[PDB]
Symmetry: C2
Subunit: 287 residues, 2 copies
Amino acid sequence: KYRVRKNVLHLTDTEKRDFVRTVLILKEKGIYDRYIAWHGAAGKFHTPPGSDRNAAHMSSAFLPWHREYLLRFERDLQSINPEVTLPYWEWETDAQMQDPSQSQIWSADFMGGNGNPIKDFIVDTGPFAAGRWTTIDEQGNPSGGLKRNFGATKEAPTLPTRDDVLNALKITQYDTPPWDMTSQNSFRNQLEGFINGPQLHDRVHRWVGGQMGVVPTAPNDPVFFLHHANVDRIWAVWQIIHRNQNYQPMKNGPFGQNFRDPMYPWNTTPEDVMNHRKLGYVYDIEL
Amino acid sequence: KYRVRKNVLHLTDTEKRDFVRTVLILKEKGIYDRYIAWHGAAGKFHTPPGSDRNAAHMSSAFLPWHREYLLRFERDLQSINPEVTLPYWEWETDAQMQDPSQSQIWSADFMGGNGNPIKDFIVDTGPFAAGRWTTIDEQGNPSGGLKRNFGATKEAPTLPTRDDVLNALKITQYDTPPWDMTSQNSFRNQLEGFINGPQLHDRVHRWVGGQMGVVPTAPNDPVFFLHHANVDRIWAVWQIIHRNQNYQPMKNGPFGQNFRDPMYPWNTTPEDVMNHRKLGYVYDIE
Ligand SMILES: [Cu+2]
Ligand SMILES: [Cu+2]
């Protein structure tokens, strides 16, 4: 419990110019791509083969898989600049605005704005605008520039609300059988957004649109990591208030989903990442 | 060093049965599938994006990437049965047969045989025959059964020969710019099989056919690992003949290809797996 992680809205200007600069360095060095690829790779590892569950989504491991992913990413940030931690995008509060698109998390000094509808929704403002930031597709080849299209779908016109988050936090069980999108009374499935969906996580992806709207390719947008830090924060909060609850399934879920199974593409297990402060970080709202 | 990887032809019946049994356990457990997936994932990781080099093939990291892969695989075998090590298929010796398909490697108590023509070359003999061994496709779903067609293509009608291997072993440089399929006078490119191809490695994949003939999905056939153990063995031989030669490139190559770059999907570097006897194994010959 040392490295913090702060609300994007509470970050000094200097902190943002430094976060963005560090992300650009990781991209230049070839490291950022590894994260895009890892995510896509996990999506093709079905547990078991033929199931809709995969190593990183639509099943128990969703939360610890992303925790590990962010942890590795934050370590790579810190190897460049030890003062840089991963911030979180508190979307539930942005949802309160008339036009969430006006949030400072899209400012030209940070993540840049919505896509330009005249350009096939290509982001042309901010540090990740086309020409300054190249994306890759699922073959692993350059794919022409970041796209975003806020709230453009009928299923996800708006971001999740504070009440949506509070309601998820009331759920007592981490997950329930059959450990997939049909799980009910499950914190995991609720937060992932498949109970009467899309809700929460799944809704944020859909709301942002562009690369974020396609799960495999989503990490092409740096906001992906901000989004997931918020998901991780919500989980950490759930763990704090439900101290006697533990990860499920403990055993006899599909291989890759159990407490002590390795999470492809790594050897890391859910047990390894259950306690976030032991990992070396904390969320501001804890302090 | 004292894990000993043996020629398939020098394995006892018991060693063969134990190897097979262990591979089937790994598959049942869900672990084998991690190896298929890793391979596929590295194939989609281009170094740099847009080029025809990838993390595991058609570039300098081809050899160390596969050495790491096999090392992880053998450690998984060992965790099931501590006596099992990864054997190697010395194809260059089978190439001397009148009919290589009669090699003991394709025994009904080891890898099983060639595919059946009237069942569209589905393997119906051995421990990995259809109904006893499922395969997965590039997308990670079930794809219906192991298939093999020995020597069916015009470009690779035969296995590489002893002289093919000897000639590769004479090359003085590990690799050369631009560190890709077009590299000349490079041991890596010669062994991988792209100098006047397809020869050696690439030739073996093409000769076996079926899943083996398609690089990403190749792992689906257990003989993949025995083939790569032979490739690793041949590299280890080269490393001793040219003991004053080291991995290349050392710096200014694409990220993921240099001596101290991590090899996607892992953090392991080529430096890490340079010396194989520091990794805990040797080949019987040595
Ligand atoms: Cu994801
Ligand atoms: Cu390969």
